[PDB]
Design a protein around this ligand. Structure first.
Ligand SMILES: CCCCCCCCCCCCCCCC(=O)O
Ligand SMILES: CCCCCCCCCCCCCCCC(=O)O
Lengths: 57, 268, 238, 255, 125, 268, 238, 57
């Protein structure tokens, strides 16, 4: 029951991972989670403000 | 993946992206294209290094203590708490609420103490590390029944091979490791104030299993913390002022930033 | 009885390693997760937030709220300079304590655009025009408006909209730049010049202030994590 | 039909005709081309005249005597003070261009000699003294041909470049210089040498003033000889034409 | 939506923002365009940067007093000593270009006055 | 695979392969068949050893330094740069532009220093190696907070087992490791000149974690570089003249080649 | 709990090994690659380039540009010798500093053909004929043209085409030869002899020069990488 | 997820390789890339010159 995933290489090859310990808190650190959502900190206003518009009409 | 710029050409329109209103509390996202003509450059750069997991997942030494094979201090006691090392504490203080598993590595190094005892025959020292959760018994002495560890977790290590290492899950009665607590213990509002309210993580002891030789030997143990599967909430501004105490955030007021010659100087 | 062979690099303690390890506490029921607002998933979500810049860090001004204010008054001439600083986010004293700077001082390399948001904090009747300019290296800093006019400049008119954005683009020879000082990867110079004047009516103050925020564009990146040279401890705090 | 010894080259508003020339050498097999969008790093719009910038500039001529060791030129520096190429590389921050090199040395049927024309990329040169490094006034000569030396330069403290010819200044055997694109002008057959060097650098664009990529070198392996009665003043001319030149980062004049 | 008093103009690497501006006047109804092939007379190839040559050059400012009669500028001469437009019109023989003119004079609500900005073609004096 | 010769028979034709024109700058590829009759010999030889990867992929010792358990020098500092060892520097100088990953192995060997202190009890020495990127803090002293390494990479090694080893990616702001740089740092053209402009790779420190014994112990560390996945551009002529300095290419002029008796001598 | 067993050769540091190793910097975004002209993929692409040979390395001539020139003049006789050298690319002083020689001094073995390109650098009216000869071992070196005529020889006529190629073939008993000197794998001898004369008209120089380039054929191979005996350091340069 | 490739043996046998580390810069050195193109350094002229032809007609 092996897990095959992709390696982090340059731009412009698969690696193998097997879990041996049965506690689920011993797995290797999950490093590939490149997801973001900057809408919470930047542009957090209630009413949408289009870029090229008089912010205060 | 980093976004790429889009090519643009000369414009003459009433709508103006550059002019906005910063009083609203909104960050105006302006591509270089809005304020000047730009060409289509694809960006193959990645934001892989920045991710919270890659930023906090590096082993850092929280605390180190010393114990002697023969002498007044034969065992070491440490309340397991962060905020004793500035490098990691500053990194953790970035987020108000944190939630991570932990990996612990113990670098134990022995050394000989100067003495006058002759005919020394050094033998492989063995080191026992024990963790007492909050409430358990305490080894008032280096030799005591508590060191049986019928339930507590422990690790035995002989000197000469790879260092010990263990993985620890998320131990907290809440849903996240709080880094800042603006309140007291008593509902009376008088009593322990600050983050020291939520620090009941136990204690960690260490001792020599066997007396190595006749001559005195001192051993020092260093503890390393490695966060795994980390989640962070509510981002916070970075420290700025050097730390003073390990039980609170008391500090000495310091200047905003280093100064320069004038307001038009290009050099520090 | 599988015959193996250890390779160089065994029984070592590498700091930035990723292996598996037996747990000290087996079969632990972790406390379930809950929805807490404002979850961070990448540090470049913090770099894209506006941070007040202490442009006026002259002498004692750093020990008061006067470091974040840039003075602007009604002058008897035109074409003088308001302020100027080099494009050194991870090194210059102006960008060192900004959120962007605090984040950059942890990583050796950096690349991307920059967004300087200027806010005029004067009266409601005071009007004016300013010329913001970014001049890449090659020559010294501009000394007169006829010299900074040739760079990348954006005239700003003070009006109902009290906020203007100066998007410092990415004009460089290398894909990345160093956060530490290095003449091989010099940044440039950002200078602001009086366009016409600051005219006020009667019974209104003729000395106003301007504030500046720094933020990163959608194309910012950082690399090579390193220790920060700001925090230090003499002994273990206790 | 026609013969291969005759060639004509047109660029911008300039033309070069040769009637006894060998085959053109085209760099490392790559003809100079503009920067593609999947390779750029500067987000600003570039400027590309391609007429004023790209044309045959004729430099100063040098005399080939019986005891001449050789000459070297820096392509970015030599054209820095000649025409709009000089004005543009002066008003900008980043520049990019390939170069066409033509060397003209003509002699009758009764002369003899042989020249080596080699375009060395990234030619760092050692100083005469181990502690010091060469100065900017000794290494590059604007619109001037810096000559070499037949004997070793003195080791006394100075900022003089090591101009010994049998080491090319870079500390190599002058014999192994062939690895680079090179042409041979033997006064027996060839009268001219043409080279086409693309843009060879480790970055997409670089500042021309603080970095000189290519260093043209002319080395007379076999000395010039003649008998009394022939003309003794035989000059050497070098014409450089930029190709596919573009710039970025408009900034206040800088010199 | 938006109002007509706000305008932004981008050219080359320069930008001009106005928050109290009137409608732009576009010459005699013709937007400046390159020379077509059915109209040229020079058989040589032309050079067109269109980035360094085309950008907002800011000239020197003059003071408006209570007794000021007016000022005049020559568009080819004024930019002759400023940037690559000056360098190019200096190294060539024939040149061709259109121009965008922006005049900035700001005053509070308690000032009064009126200026006339006129582009006179062929102004022999 | 090496090409094989083709069999040929006596010819009498106007076209002549041997006669060419070397002024063109073209290498005339002439098979032995053109200048003499040859038989069909298949070649099973291979050019496998020559490939750039096999030529440069061999561990080579760049620099070695020394540190003492007790004494004036308790820690070692080295700016990570090549050009300190002639054997590897000469191999790398063959190509103007190089691009490779790296494998680093640290051979740490300790020895006892002569002294008069009696009753020595030697203990397993532990060695810590730390890498500070350009800009980070510097351990002004052997004992300092910098050695916590909350972010910097580090390796701990006890004496007695296999040597440490790590892999390093391609760290450069450009697209290739430049080996030659004909320019200055300042656009003024006055300042650092040469390849030392593009050397900002950081610094590498090393120290003893624990004092081994009472008697002084000196340890020497050697650093080995192993290029991996190497790519080379623009081939260059080989050095010839011995190196003098590690910051530039300054040299002393030397003869083209060793001499002989005359122009017709068959012996050196 | 998998039972294993270590074999002889464990926990060693072999120099020419190829294993895997944990990276010190995880998740590093490598700078992308770009097209740079002249990519090398094999060292035998450098050995196939012509390299000037210093045939006249006699005494002081090695300290000037006179080492690469071979003198040839109008003689009063015929059948004399112009030059000669043994076929020792990795050992003889003549081929030691050539590109081919510099490459060969890194590898113990070598095999393949050789291409000697001769270029006449005289006047346009001077004509002549030369006899290039390669004599395999078995006897000494040839001493007169009647003795080198029996080898492998190519008459060269000086004309419009000023370049002639002498293809020294592969005539040996072993598949490979040593770059170091060894009588068991002797190479041979390359000698050039005046065929008729070098005749010039009036008012033209009667002393001309010839140059020689060495290169490898399409069938060259090298093996057993070794250290070069040319570069040396007394101490770590600093 | 194993990779099976051929071994470098004499002339006139498969080996197994598995990637364990997930950085793509830790793989073993790729030694078998026997590709060449000597057209860039030798014969780099613009106009093709056939072998048996007067190089300068
Ligand atoms: C041999 C001993 C093994 C077990 C040792 C466990 C010690 C660590 C216990 C968990 C601590 C987690 C971190 C708490 C502090 C914080 O979150 O700020
Ligand atoms: C415990 C330390 C681990 C990390 C050590 C890294 C040291 C090497 C850094 C990269 C250097 C690469 C080579 C640069 C010099 C060159 O290319 O010429």
């Amino acid at each position: 029951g092996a897990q095959v995933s992709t390696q982090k290489t340059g731009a412009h090859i698969h690696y193998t991972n097997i879990n041996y310990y049965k506690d689920a808190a011993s797995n290797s650190a999950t490093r590939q989670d490149f997801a973001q959502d900057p809408g919470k900190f930047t542009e957090p206003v209630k009413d949408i403000m289009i870029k090229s518009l008089p912010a205060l009409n | 993946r980093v976004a790429d710029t889009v090519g643009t050409g000369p414009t003459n329109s009433e709508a103006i992206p550059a002019l906005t209103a910063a009083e609203t509390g909104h960050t105006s996202q302006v591509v270089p294209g809005d304020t000047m003509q730009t060409r289509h450059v694809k960006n193959y750069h990645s934001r892989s290094e920045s991710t919270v997991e890659n930023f906090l997942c590096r082993s850092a030494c929280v605390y180190f203590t010393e114990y002697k094979n023969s002498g007044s201090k034969r065992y070491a006691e440490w309340v397991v708490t962060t905020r004793q090392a500035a490098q990691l504490r500053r990194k953790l203080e970035f987020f108000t609420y944190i939630r991570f598993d932990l990996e612990l590595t113990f670098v134990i190094t022995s050394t000989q103490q100067p003495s006058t005892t002759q005919n020394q025959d050094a033998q492989i020292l063995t080191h026992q590390i024990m963790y007492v959760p909050p409430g358990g018994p305490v080894p008032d002495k280096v030799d005591s029944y508590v060191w049986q560890t019928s339930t507590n977790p422990s690790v035995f290590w002989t000197e000469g091979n790879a260092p010990p290492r263990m993985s620890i899950p998320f131990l907290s009665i809440g849903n996240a490791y709080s880094n800042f607590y603006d309140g007291w213990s008593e509902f009376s509002r008088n009593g322990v104030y600050g983050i020291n309210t939520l620090n009941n993580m136990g204690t960690l002891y260490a001792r020599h299993v066997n007396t190595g030789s006749t001559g005195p030997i001192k051993s020092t143990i260093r503890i390393y913390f490695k966060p795994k599967h980390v989640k962070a909430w509510i981002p916070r501004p970075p420290r700025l002022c050097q730390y003073e105490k390990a039980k609170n955030v008391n500090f000495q007021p310091s200047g905003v930033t280093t100064t320069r010659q004038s307001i038009t100087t290009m050099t520090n | 009885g599988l015959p193996t062979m250890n390779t160089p690099g065994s029984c070592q303690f590498l700091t930035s390693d990723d292996f598996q390890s037996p747990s000290a506490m087996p079969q632990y029921d972790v406390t379930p997760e809950m929805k807490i607002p404002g979850e961070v998933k990448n540090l470049m979500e913090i770099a894209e937030v506006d941070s007040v810049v202490p442009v006026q860090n002259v002498g004692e001004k750093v020990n008061s709220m006067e470091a974040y204010q840039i003075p602007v008054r009604s002058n008897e001439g035109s074409g003088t300079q308001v302020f100027g600083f080099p494009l050194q986010p991870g090194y210059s004293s102006v960008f060192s304590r900004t959120l962007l700077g605090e984040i950059l001082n942890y990583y050796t390399h950096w690349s991307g655009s920059i967004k300087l948001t200027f806010m005029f904090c004067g009266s409601a009747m005071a009007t004016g025009k300013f010329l913001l300019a970014y001049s890449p290296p090659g020559a010294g800093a501009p000394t007169k408006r006829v010299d900074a006019m040739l760079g990348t400049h954006v005239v700003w008119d003070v009006g109902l909209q009290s906020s203007c954005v100066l998007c410092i683009p990415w004009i460089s020879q290398t894909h990345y730049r160093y956060v530490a000082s290095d003449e091989y990867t010099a940044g440039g110079f950002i200078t602001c010049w009086y366009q016409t004047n600051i005219v006020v009516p009667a019974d209104a103050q003729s000395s106003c202030y301007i504030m500046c925020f720094v933020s990163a564009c959608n194309d910012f990146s950082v690399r090579l994590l390193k220790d920060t040279p700001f925090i230090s401890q003499n002994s273990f705090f206790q | 039909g026609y013969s291969d010894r005759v060639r004509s080259i047109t660029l911008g508003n300039s033309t070069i005709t040769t009637q006894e020339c060998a085959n053109v050498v085209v760099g490392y097999g790559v003809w100079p081309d503009y920067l593609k969008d999947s390779e750029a790093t500067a987000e600003d719009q570039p400027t590309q005249p391609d007429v004023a910038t790209c044309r045959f500039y004729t430099l100063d001529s040098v005399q080939w005597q019986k005891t001449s060791p050789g000459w070297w030129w820096k392509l970015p520096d030599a054209l820095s003070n000649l025409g709009l190429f000089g004005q543009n590389m002066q008003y900008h921050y980043l520049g990019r261009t390939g170069y066409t090199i033509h060397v003209q040395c003509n002699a009758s049927k009764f002369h003899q000699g042989c020249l080596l024309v080699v375009c060395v990329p990234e030619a760092e040169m050692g100083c005469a003294t181990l502690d010091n490094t060469p100065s900017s006034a000794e290494l590059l000569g604007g619109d001037a041909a810096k000559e070499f030396a037949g004997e070793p330069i003195a080791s006394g403290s100075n900022k003089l470049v090591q101009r010994v010819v049998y080491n090319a200044g870079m500390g190599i055997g002058v014999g192994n210089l062939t690895i680079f694109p090179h042409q041979w002008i033997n006064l027996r057959t060839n009268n001219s040498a043409t080279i086409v060097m693309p843009y060879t650098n480790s970055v997409p664009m670089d500042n021309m003033f603080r970095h000189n990529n290519i260093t043209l070198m002319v080395i007379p392996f076999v000395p010039l000889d003649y008998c009394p009665g022939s003309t003794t003043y035989v000059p050497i001319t070098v014409t450089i034409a930029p190709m596919c030149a573009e710039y970025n980062g408009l900034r206040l004049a800088s010199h």
